[PDB]
């Protein structure tokens, strides 16, 4: 997609939270990065898991909140884990 | 719509943080998030609203708000506050 | 240390004298708040945890927004007996 | 350890912050809390401890840390990351 790359094209180099969505908006995995950059597009290029590569399939849209520090970016987290309850967060939790 | 929820909704800032919505008694029976209080929690007492947040609606006599610093600490208020209060329409408004 | 309590909002953690935290509170003010628990009259709940409280120590926040988060975190560490049962 | 862990306890920060120990697998099995980081990683392999200290301190690996800016948020990254880890000697220890 192209509005798409749009958004993975000026993702900062910054810490926080970013949130996965589906084709209808909801929250799929929450995730926690020291570069929102870095992080957010791994999980568009390269090679990964079959468990993550389902989660990889499912990605419609992104969102982000940029924290000031790493210490912020976990504790934003745990909370947004918390309010989403995201699909893949409990799926890909345990080993394997 | 009393004089003293009025002049509360007067004072909002344009600011994120959380807001606390609260019965006729006192007690908080919703908890949510803004960036901006001021146009979030105005927007319940304007325009149209689904059934349910309808019900909600006719339920606030008062509000208190807390001003973060930024949206994320906002969202981080927001969970803490749920946990503090465990609000009715938390539940109830639930997709 | 009540008397080098500083007028900042934060959270108190008022303790048994065999050393527990007995209840986690929060401050927009812990000078006045903590202050006020050993002055003026009191009603029954409040007066028994005020006999009970041997010491106290406090976390100073930036903001009352802070605080809250601080508070329901101490709760969650210490799980204070006087939290549990002094239900507003 | 070998050359590696001495030199990662030698960069230790004295920054204040959360440390995260790990296994041999890379498990999180203890979170705690430090005003000197540099200063209480470096204490558990060094000195004496008790016994259920002892246990932890065979099983460390590795460790990570988060430096933290405030009392406030050291203790709330503290509790937050133990949440997130359910770590087996925060169970066992308290
Ligand atoms: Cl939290
Ligand atoms: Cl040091
Ligand atoms: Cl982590």
Same mark, same amino acid.
């Given at each position: 997609?192209?509005?798409? &790359?749009? /958004?993975?094209?000026?993702?900062?180099?910054?810490?926080?939270?970013?949130?996965? &969505?589906? /084709?209808?908006?909801t929250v799929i995995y929450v995730g926690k990065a020291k570069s929102l950059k870095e992080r957010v597009r791994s999980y568009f290029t390269g090679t990964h898991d079959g468990k993550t590569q389902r989660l990889v399939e499912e990605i419609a849209d992104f969102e982000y909140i940029v924290?000031?520090?790493?210490?912020?970016?976990?504790?934003?987290?745990?909370?947004?884990?918390?309010?989403?309850?995201?699909?893949?967060?409990?799926?890909?939790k345990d080993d394997k």
């Open positions: 997609n192209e509005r798409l &790359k749009e /958004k993975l094209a000026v993702l900062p180099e910054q810490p926080g939270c970013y949130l996965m &969505k589906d /084709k209808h908006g924290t000031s520090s790493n210490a912020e970016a976990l504790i934003l987290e745990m909370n947004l884990i918390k309010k989403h309850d995201p699909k893949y967060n409990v799926m890909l």
